[PDB]
């Protein structure tokens, strides 16, 4: 069934599961033509496939060449997503294949279900959570590898850096979604918070700065404050 606030801790049990977010697969800029009509230009995108228990991220880069000569691209993007997710599962050894795939947008259910017909025992699940994975391209190193790609490419990351050496999956996931929620609501302020102090650096093999435990407490509170301020602004509350 659908994933919601009630069955939230299932994400951190030992049943392998992946989130799939397709929000950044088909990305365009909208511009005016010489004749004054509107046209789009595609830019590179990505499928965001994440194991919330381990932090392993399978970032499949979608190169603009995929779209060449194709129609109804927003619909095609959903099927390309499902094709690539299915190829990923096939590429994994049996004991690493997920038992569930949770799609962040309900429009992905039928395409993934059809692409996964060969895996009848992998459950394809929607979610009611309003997860902020669209802000993945606010993470500088992820945006950079996507935009520099010259061809289709799979790039692997751990989205939790080394946090799991010190905190649990549940807490790691709460931090990730907090950071991304903030980046989504006000990217400039979120990024200021994360980088203000120049003495706290990002390891070459990490995505986020090397905060101490106490500094993460301060960061998380600043992100909370950011998110509440922006809410008051949005609704005049």
């Amino acid at each position: 069934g659908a994933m919601n606030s009630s069955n939230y801790a299932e994400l951190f049990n030992n049943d392998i599961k992946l989130f799939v977010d397709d929000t950044n697969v088909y990305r365009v800029t909208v511009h005016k033509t010489f004749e004054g009509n509107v046209a789009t230009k595609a830019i590179n995108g990505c499928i965001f496939t994440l194991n919330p228990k381990t932090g392993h991220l399978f970032l499949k880069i979608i190169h603009t060449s995929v779209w060449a000569g194709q129609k109804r691209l927003s619909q095609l993007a959903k099927w390309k997503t499902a094709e690539e997710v299915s190829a990923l599962v096939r590429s994994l050894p049996k004991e690493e294949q997920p038992k569930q795939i949770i799609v962040t947008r309900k429009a992905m259910l039928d395409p993934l279900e059809v692409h996964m017909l060969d895996f009848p025992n992998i459950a394809i699940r929607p979610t009611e959570l309003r997860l902020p994975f669209s802000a993945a391209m606010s993470i500088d190193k992820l945006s950079d590898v996507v935009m520099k790609a010259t061809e289709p490419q799979m790039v692997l990351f751990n989205i939790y850096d080394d946090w799991l050496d010190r905190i649990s999956s549940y807490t790691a996931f709460s931090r990730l979604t907090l950071l991304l929620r903030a980046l989504k609501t006000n990217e400039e302020s979120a990024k200021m918070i994360l980088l203000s102090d120049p003495t706290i650096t990002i390891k070459s093999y990490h995505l986020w700065p090397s905060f101490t435990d106490e500094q993460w407490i301060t960061i998380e509170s600043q992100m909370r404050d950011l998110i509440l301020t922006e809410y008051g602004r949005k609704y005049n509350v």
Partner: protein, 300 residues
């Protein structure tokens, strides 16, 4: 013209024959239905005055035998049976007519309704969907589930409709996932028509039989099957032109005959709105669309 005599009518029952129906009182001297048109299948069905659940009845074709009805006080239902003694049967039919204890199949000469509803329905195909090979006629009732329903419990009593499933390997060629899911033409024309049904007439026959069982018995799995076979055609971009024109006629007469009060459980909103207004064949069902809009605009 053929006859289906009744031994007696011990319990108050509403008797249907095709789209017609008569009320018969407990131990009323009722002894059959005469002047039944030869050349079509027929269905005689029952609903007891005491149990408006369980409508039930028998599909039959008078060319295949002499059939009659007899109430069974143990099983408590009107049973169809075959009489093999041709002389004993003419004798009963003649004496009951002489005594004028038989209703006449009340067909208006202008009326092709029953023909239009049963055009492709063959008794031999019915007997493969309702498997009971010792009888020439077939029992169906409100509660019988289909084989596909059974997959998601007693197989002897199942409706063996052809299984249609849009999210299955059968329907989806590897490597053509998106193409085949959005354009079911492959599934319709190669898998179903050429593969399984062999021709469009057998397909239409099952579709018509499914509709009639849903209408006459409120059989829910039959209604599911009727809608699936409509949706498969309407969701195919490439359909033989003769099939589209015939489908428009088939559906028109089905919608025409449906009881107005039943349009709520018998018509799947999503399928009809998709077929009439979204599908590849939105513009190919002009008669069906016109009657749906003037009779059931709420559903749309």
């Amino acid at each position: 013209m053929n006859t289906v005599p009744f031994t007696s009518a011990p319990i108050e029952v509403t008797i249907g024959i095709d789209q017609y129906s008569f009320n018969v009182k407990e131990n009323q001297p009722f002894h059959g239905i005469k002047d039944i048109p030869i050349g079509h299948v027929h269905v005689i069905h029952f609903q007891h005055a005491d149990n408006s659940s369980m409508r039930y009845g028998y599909w039959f074709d008078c060319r295949m035998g002499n059939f009659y009805i007899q109430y069974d006080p143990k099983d408590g239902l009107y049973k169809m049976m075959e009489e093999r003694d041709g002389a004993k049967f003419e004798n009963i039919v003649h004496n009951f007519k002489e005594r004028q204890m038989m209703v006449s199949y009340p067909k208006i000469d202008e009326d092709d309704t029953w023909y239009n509803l049963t055009e492709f329905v063959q008794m031999d195909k019915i007997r493969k969907i309702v498997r009971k090979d010792e009888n020439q006629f077939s029992y169906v009732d409100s509660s019988m589930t289909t084989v596909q329903e059974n997959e998601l419990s007693d197989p002897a009593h199942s409706l063996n409709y052809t299984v249609i499933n849009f999210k299955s390997r059968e329907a989806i060629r590897p490597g053509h996932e998106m193409e085949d899911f959005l354009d079911k033409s492959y599934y319709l024309n190669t898998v179903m028509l050429q593969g399984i049904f062999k021709n469009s007439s057998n397909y239409f026959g099952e579709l018509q039989f499914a509709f009639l069982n849903a209408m006459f018995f409120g059989n829910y799995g039959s209604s599911l099957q009727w809608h699936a076979m409509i949706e498969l055609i309407c969701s195919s971009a490439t359909v033989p032109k003769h099939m589209l024109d015939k489908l428009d006629e088939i559906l028109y007469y089905q919608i025409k005959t449906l009881p107005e009060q039943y349009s709520d459980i018998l018509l799947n909103e999503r399928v009809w709105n998709i077929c009439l207004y979204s599908s590849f064949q939105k513009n190919s069902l002009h008669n069906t669309e016109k009657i749906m809009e003037n009779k059931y605009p709420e559903l749309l």
